[PDB]
Design a protein around this ligand. Sequence first.
Ligand SMILES: [Cl-]
Ligand SMILES: [Cl-]
Lengths: 108, 104, 108, 104
Amino acid sequence: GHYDVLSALQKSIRGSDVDASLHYTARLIEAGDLPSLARRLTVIAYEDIGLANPEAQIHTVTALDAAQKIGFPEARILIANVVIDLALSPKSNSAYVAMDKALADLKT
Amino acid sequence: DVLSALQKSIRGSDVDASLHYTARLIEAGDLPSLARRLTVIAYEDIGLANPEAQIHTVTALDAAQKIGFPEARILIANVVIDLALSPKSNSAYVAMDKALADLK
Amino acid sequence: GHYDVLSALQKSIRGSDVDASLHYTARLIEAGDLPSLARRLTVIAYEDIGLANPEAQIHTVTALDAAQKIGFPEARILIANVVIDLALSPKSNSAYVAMDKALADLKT
Amino acid sequence: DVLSALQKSIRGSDVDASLHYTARLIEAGDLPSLARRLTVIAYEDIGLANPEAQIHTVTALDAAQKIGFPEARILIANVVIDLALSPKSNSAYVAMDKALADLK
Ligand SMILES: [Cl-]
Ligand SMILES: [Cl-]
């Protein structure tokens, strides 16, 4: 599943570290699991970038759905655009925090 | 009617209330009906005041249905906050229902 | 097929006549053929608006694909946004003309 | 190689030549291969210079495959002119292949 590498990719993007983000992405492309990489990058776009740059989510979902159809090797070019966009995007996890607060606030 | 309470809260630009009713609807467990209603709200209550909100809403909700819970709640949160904060218009909805009434 | 009403809708949008565009759209919604209405509005977005407003095509395809899933009656609200957008959009059919010129120019 | 001639014409920002090779490819009749290549060109040759071009390209080509000919040629024309006129970047492509080479 390469969950260790997926975690390193999320930390790299959260830390706005574009060279490390591309390195961990390269390791996942060589391993060949496009579905798990597309799923994690979609979650990162909404969790870590979120409301700071809504257009990053449009470009991420569009590229990753197209990538899963095109398949490797050409899919690596679509993924490269996504990873650079997310690593160098303004970022806010406030949507994630607000959602979990609303769930915690429900009467039990 | 929790879906109608969510629509009223988004129309009123009330982020905290909108997320409260969203949390209740996530726990009630009908994602298709929540997604359908948020899509309608984006075109009915935001509409021409902020067309980008419709692209954000449809993109996030289609992706949310594909990734499922638990992560779908994060995508839904982005949609609900966007719609609650967005400028508001009912002009396209009104124009359409005026034109349909004119046929009779 | 209501091809007469679909033709009147295209002429209404080409002529930037928003009230006539909504009237012909209303007639097609009452008739109930969402697929034929979605197909014609997609072609109008690329043929008549085209390169003058590329974002009109993104908003049109997004709304109409969502509409065909939601179904009437709520689909009328999505379609209303599309028809007003296209009727009041800047317009150029230059992509249509250039494509047909390139086909006519091929050696035979 | 007509697909490679189309890529060279788009890279050179040559609208007339790009539409010439597109017309040849439409008549040759393989829409899936033309759509795949134009999608790759949008991310490889335009890339970060104009991200909107990728949204336009994927949206139009998916719709073109769904509506078929004859109308698909109009959607394809919008894509090819957009990519030929667009600002050009290979920076994302290069960065990705540099990172993959660094693994070895
Ligand atoms: Cl994951
Ligand atoms: Cl038609």
